[PDB]
Design a binder for this molecule. Structure first.
Ligand SMILES: [Zn+2]
Ligand SMILES: [Zn+2]
Ligand SMILES: [Zn+2]
Length: 459
């Protein structure tokens, strides 16, 4: 039960305005045949063009919304819309391209998908709200067959060239003219009432309808992300390493230890309220403080209301000591907080566009994150960069130019000359910090926080 049986029934009601007379009784097998493709009873790794919801969720990085609108069916021009914002007009002879034959339109489709997907995924999943013209247009830019490898590398083939008769992955496809063995899913098969816009607009106010194909493509993918990652959540699903996941995750643990250790040293809070992941461990295990944990899963829909987290009656006195919100997204942080908050607006290979201004951050697991909101931090200030160490100045065991920095908070810098060990550790910490910030994480702290208070923790 891993792949979608071609003998599964497909509901055709959504197709019958573009394809009048379409049979009510329809399988994937007969739909694929109707789309002009032949599957030849092939056991060669491509059992169906269409995939299950579970398979689609495992391949979220591959998702490309796709819509086709009648522009005036072989007689008339077609507007091809993609969740990339691209609109192409194909003639049978926000970006909006003038009408051109299929032989040149297919070249632009391969370039667009290859540049979008090469750093994300080994495939494409076309996310549909299928009404018929999108399915009958696939024969003009898709070829299918056995699973293949790239002509220049070991990656599976995603593109075909009629010029050279060869196959390529997204990395090696320059000049290629056909999409090869795409996948697709029709969201309309999931059991909705009413049209795309009415279902999309229940959950999201950020994607409008300009009545162009790319708008529908964007709304379709947005609705699918809502259904699979907002209303439903699965943190058991692991996703492949495609980038700096491991360095980012390590940097996060190092920065969290540094910042909390320094806040406790600087302001000597008697209690810390650690609000968020129910799996969280003490990030500063040697600290003197009373460490109290409060369980909150990562919110995927709306930021938590601080009133619901804290009130309904716990130390209960969250105004005592300091509150730690490490990726615990709330509408408004209390004044006595240490905060790490993911900025959903960040461009990266890990951060995919999401629902209602939220983003889908995929790093080992998929986390749909509510829209970044600057107003959440009104009681706090941005945490400045600093490095603190009480460790002995001792090298042990890479070449040196002497470090000069006001933000190297060590005995040796207090003494007027940074030692090689603390210089090496500072530069490693600065790289880790810049990695985590570049990844989209933002750091906020209570307004009284002052690194000047750390110098007297050496005497
Ligand atoms: Zn390749
Ligand atoms: Zn939306
Ligand atoms: Zn030192």
């Amino acid at each position: 039960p891993t792949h979608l049986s071609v003998d599964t029934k497909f509901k055709t009601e959504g197709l019958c305005v573009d394809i009048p007379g379409i049979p009510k009784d329809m399988t994937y097998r007969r739909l694929i045949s109707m789309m002009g493709f032949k599957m030849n009873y092939q056991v060669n790794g491509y059992p169906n063009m269409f995939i299950t919801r579970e398979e689609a969720i495992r391949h979220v990085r591959a998702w490309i919304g796709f819509d086709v609108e009648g522009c005036h069916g072989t007689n008339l021009p077609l507007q091809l819309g993609f969740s990339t914002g691209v609109n192409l007009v194909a003639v049978p002879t926000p970006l909006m391209y003038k009408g051109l034959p299929w032989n040149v339109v297919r070249i632009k489709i391969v370039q667009m998908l290859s540049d979008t997907l090469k750093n994300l995924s080994d495939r494409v999943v076309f996310v549909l709200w299928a009404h018929g013209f999108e399915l009958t247009s696939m024969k003009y830019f898709v070829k299918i067959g056995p699973e293949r490898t790239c002509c220049l590398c070991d990656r599976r083939a995603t593109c075909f060239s009629t010029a050279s008769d060869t196959y390529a992955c997204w990395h090696h496809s320059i000049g290629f003219d056909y999409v090869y063995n795409p996948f697709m899913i029709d969201v309309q098969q999931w059991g909705f009432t009413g049209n795309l816009q009415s279902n999309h607009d229940l959950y999201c106010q950020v994607h409008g309808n300009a009545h162009v194909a790319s708008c529908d493509a964007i709304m379709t993918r947005c609705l699918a992300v809502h259904e699979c990652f907002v209303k439903r959540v699965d943190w058991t699903i692991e996703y492949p390493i495609i980038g700096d996941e491991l360095k980012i995750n390590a940097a996060c643990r190092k920065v969290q230890h540094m910042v909390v250790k320094a806040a406790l040293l600087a302001d000597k809070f008697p209690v810390l309220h650690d609000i968020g992941n129910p799996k969280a461990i003490k990030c500063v295990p040697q600290a003197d403080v009373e460490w109290k944990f409060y369980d909150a899963q990562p919110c995927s829909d709306k930021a938590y209301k601080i009133e619901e987290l804290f009130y309904s009656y716990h130390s209960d006195k969250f105004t005592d000591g300091v509150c730690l919100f490490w990726n615990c997204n709330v509408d408004r942080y209390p004044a006595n907080s240490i905060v790490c908050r993911f900025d959903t607006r960040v461009l990266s290979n890990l951060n995919l566009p999401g629902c209602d201004g939220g983003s889908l951050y995929v790093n080992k697991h998929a986390f749909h994150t509510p829209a970044f909101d600057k107003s959440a931090f009104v009681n706090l200030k941005q945490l400045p960069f600093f490095y603190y160490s009480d460790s002995p100045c001792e090298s042990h065991g890479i070449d040196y130019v002497p470090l000069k920095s006001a933000t190297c908070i060590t005995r040796c810098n207090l003494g007027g000359a940074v030692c090689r060990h603390h210089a090496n550790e500072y530069r490693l910490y600065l790289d880790a910090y810049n990695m985590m910030i570049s990844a989209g994480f933002s750091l906020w702290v209570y307004k009284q926080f002052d690194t000047y208070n750390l110098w007297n923790t050496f005497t």
